[PDB]
Protein backbone atom coordinates (compact mmCIF):
# COMPACT_ATOMS: atom_id res chain seq x y z
CA UNK A 1 0.00 0.00 0.00
CA UNK A 2 1.09 3.55 0.78
CA UNK A 3 3.11 5.03 3.64
CA UNK A 4 5.05 2.93 6.14
CA UNK A 5 3.36 3.02 9.53
CA UNK A 6 0.01 4.08 8.10
CA UNK A 7 -1.05 5.01 11.64
CA UNK A 8 -3.39 7.94 12.27
CA UNK A 9 -4.63 9.53 15.50
CA UNK A 10 -7.71 11.71 15.94
CA UNK A 11 -7.13 14.96 17.82
CA UNK A 12 -9.87 17.57 18.19
CA UNK A 13 -8.63 21.11 18.82
CA UNK A 14 -10.59 23.63 20.88
CA UNK A 15 -10.41 27.37 20.18
CA UNK A 16 -9.76 29.68 23.13
CA UNK A 17 -9.95 33.41 23.83
CA UNK A 18 -6.60 33.79 22.08
CA UNK A 19 -7.12 31.13 19.43
CA UNK A 20 -5.41 27.99 18.15
CA UNK A 21 -1.81 27.98 19.32
CA UNK A 22 -0.50 25.22 17.07
CA UNK A 23 0.59 26.39 13.61
CA UNK A 24 0.83 24.50 10.32
CA UNK A 25 2.73 25.14 7.08
CA UNK A 26 2.60 23.50 3.66
CA UNK A 27 1.82 24.48 0.08
CA UNK A 28 0.20 21.33 -1.32
CA UNK A 29 0.22 19.11 1.81
CA UNK A 30 -0.51 20.11 5.40
CA UNK A 31 1.69 19.42 8.43
CA UNK A 32 1.91 21.01 11.88
CA UNK A 33 5.23 22.77 12.48
CA UNK A 34 4.56 24.27 15.91
CA UNK A 35 2.30 23.22 18.79
CA UNK A 36 0.92 25.06 21.82
CA UNK A 37 3.01 23.62 24.65
CA UNK A 38 1.03 23.25 27.88
CA UNK A 39 -1.98 24.70 26.08
CA UNK A 40 -4.96 23.72 23.94
CA UNK A 41 -2.65 21.87 21.55
CA UNK A 42 -0.86 19.95 24.30
CA UNK A 43 -4.22 19.03 25.83
CA UNK A 44 -5.59 17.96 22.45
CA UNK A 45 -2.60 15.67 21.94
CA UNK A 46 -0.73 17.41 19.13
CA UNK A 47 2.86 16.74 18.09
CA UNK A 48 5.44 19.01 16.45
CA UNK A 49 5.96 18.22 12.78
CA UNK A 50 2.85 16.07 12.45
CA UNK A 51 1.19 15.26 9.12
CA UNK A 52 -2.40 16.38 8.52
CA UNK A 53 -4.67 13.88 6.78
CA UNK A 54 -7.98 15.73 6.96
CA UNK A 55 -9.85 18.42 8.90
CA UNK A 56 -13.25 17.57 10.38
CA UNK A 57 -13.67 14.73 7.90
CA UNK A 58 -12.77 17.03 5.02
CA UNK A 59 -9.68 16.56 2.86
CA UNK A 60 -7.49 19.61 2.27
CA UNK A 61 -6.67 20.34 -1.37
CA UNK A 62 -5.24 23.28 -3.31
CA UNK A 63 -2.28 25.34 -2.09
CA UNK A 64 -3.41 28.08 0.29
CA UNK A 65 -2.56 28.44 3.98
CA UNK A 66 -5.35 31.01 4.35
CA UNK A 67 -7.87 28.37 3.30
CA UNK A 68 -6.49 25.93 5.86
CA UNK A 69 -6.45 28.60 8.55
CA UNK A 70 -9.97 29.67 7.62
CA UNK A 71 -11.03 26.03 7.54
CA UNK A 72 -9.54 25.36 10.98
CA UNK A 73 -10.84 28.65 12.39
CA UNK A 74 -14.21 27.91 10.76
CA UNK A 75 -15.27 26.71 14.20
CA UNK A 76 -14.14 26.57 17.82
CA UNK A 77 -14.03 22.77 17.95
CA UNK A 78 -12.65 21.20 14.78
CA UNK A 79 -11.35 17.66 14.31
CA UNK A 80 -7.85 17.27 12.87
CA UNK A 81 -6.90 13.81 11.61
CA UNK A 82 -3.10 13.67 11.67
CA UNK A 83 -0.49 10.98 11.03
CA UNK A 84 2.72 10.12 12.85
CA UNK A 85 4.57 7.16 14.32
CA UNK A 86 6.18 7.72 17.77
CA UNK A 87 9.86 6.81 18.42
CA UNK A 88 11.09 3.23 18.34
CA UNK A 89 13.52 3.12 21.25
E strand intervals along 6-83? 8-14, 23-25, 31-34, 50-55, 77-83
Per-residue CA distances from 51 to 18, 41, 83 (Å): 24, 15, 5
Other beta carbons within 10 Å of 40: 18
| Method used experimentally | NMR
Please check whether the domain covering 1-89 is classified as CATH 2.40.70.10: no
d(CA 73, CA 58): 14
Instruction: Please enumerate, as own/partner, the contacts of 57-61 that have beta carbons within 8 Å and a separation of 24 or more.
Output: 57/81, 60/30
Question: How many Cα atoms occupy the beta-carbon half-sphere of 6 within 13 Å?
Answer: 4
Q: What angle do CA 4, 9, 14 make, to 5 degrees?
A: 145
Q: Check if the beta carbon of residue 20 is closer than 8 Å to that of residue 42.
A: no
Domain range list for the chain: 1-89
Amino acid sequence: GSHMGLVQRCVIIQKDDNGFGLTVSGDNPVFVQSVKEDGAAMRAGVQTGDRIIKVNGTLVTHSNHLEVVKLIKSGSYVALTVQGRPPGS
